Amino acid sequence: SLRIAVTPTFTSYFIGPLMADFYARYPSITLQLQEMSQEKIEDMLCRDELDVGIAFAPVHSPELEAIPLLTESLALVVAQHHPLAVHEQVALSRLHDEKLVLLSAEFATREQIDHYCEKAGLHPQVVIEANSISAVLELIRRTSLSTLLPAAIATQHDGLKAISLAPPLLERTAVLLRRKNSWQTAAAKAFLHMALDKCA
Amino acid sequence: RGSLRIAVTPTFTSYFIGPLMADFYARYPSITLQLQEMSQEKIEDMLCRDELDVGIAFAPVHSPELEAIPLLTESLALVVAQHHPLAVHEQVALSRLHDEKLVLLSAEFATREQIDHYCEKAGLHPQVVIEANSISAVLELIRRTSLSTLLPAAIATQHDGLKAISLAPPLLERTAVLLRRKNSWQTAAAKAFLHMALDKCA
Fold this sequence. Notes:
Chain B: One of its GO terms (cellular component) is protein-DNA complex. The first copy, chain A, is α/β, with parallel strands linked by helices.
């Protein structure tokens, strides 16, 4: 009965493949996956309500151990018919003229976006906000709007492309979390190992 | 030149609201849009407090101060990947669920609540090997395995690698509804949105 929790960005590109592979390898293990804020993941782990979590550094809880997983970098994600979809990379200043669909303020990703946009002197117009990554992706594929999301998400979807931002806007280190000195089951350990191999 | 605050229950995020909002935006680019998926209860509550302009959920509505407009009928289907053994059929007997290993939404979702209730009622107790608090995650799991899930048939249409198999005796059918607080006049945008919502279901 492996209980997994991840911050919202991972749901859109990381966890699906990994869990599918794990299930295929170990069909007898019942899986539970929940996406939620990092704070809630850290708290639930402390209370042994979860076996493994996936979030970002820095971890706020001392009783938790963090193992670097990968680097997540924000890109301008657009549909193939977007004017900028022709480039592989674009200058950060381009954001000024972009009409964006973004995740709402309760998402850590949106918080970081605002902070670093402010820091870089960028204030693009946000015409649409949604509290769902899937909703944002749907909106971008059907319009000429763009969004700011981890580049890894575009790879998962055909009609979407991730445009790297010249001076990068946001880079974060994804981490695997587990409560220290509270030992793991064979399934949990296998899962952690699989998560690392996939990122190797 | 105004704003439009929309709320919808989870299933609509996966097939209905995306196309509708994209069309609305294209038609009225000057209107700022805000979309939030949440439980029906929270949608009804927020509407009563004028914290939303329009909501989409299901009958029956519990709040008297809200007006409901029938939108469409949502029926649960067995959603599988094209390589699923049953993907060859367009319809299967409900008894098939017994042998299915399912990936379902967790207990906090009304959709899961209804699934459990009607399965119990029909004398069906399929094995649930994976639970997730996200429709997207469920879909990704189904695409990559030979498991199946129970979701609105309309979702499969949106995804190529997925097929919705109709259930002989249906399992669950719900009336989707548009919600707006009565006697509290709507903006031009809100009214336009409602009309567009209906046209797309016409």
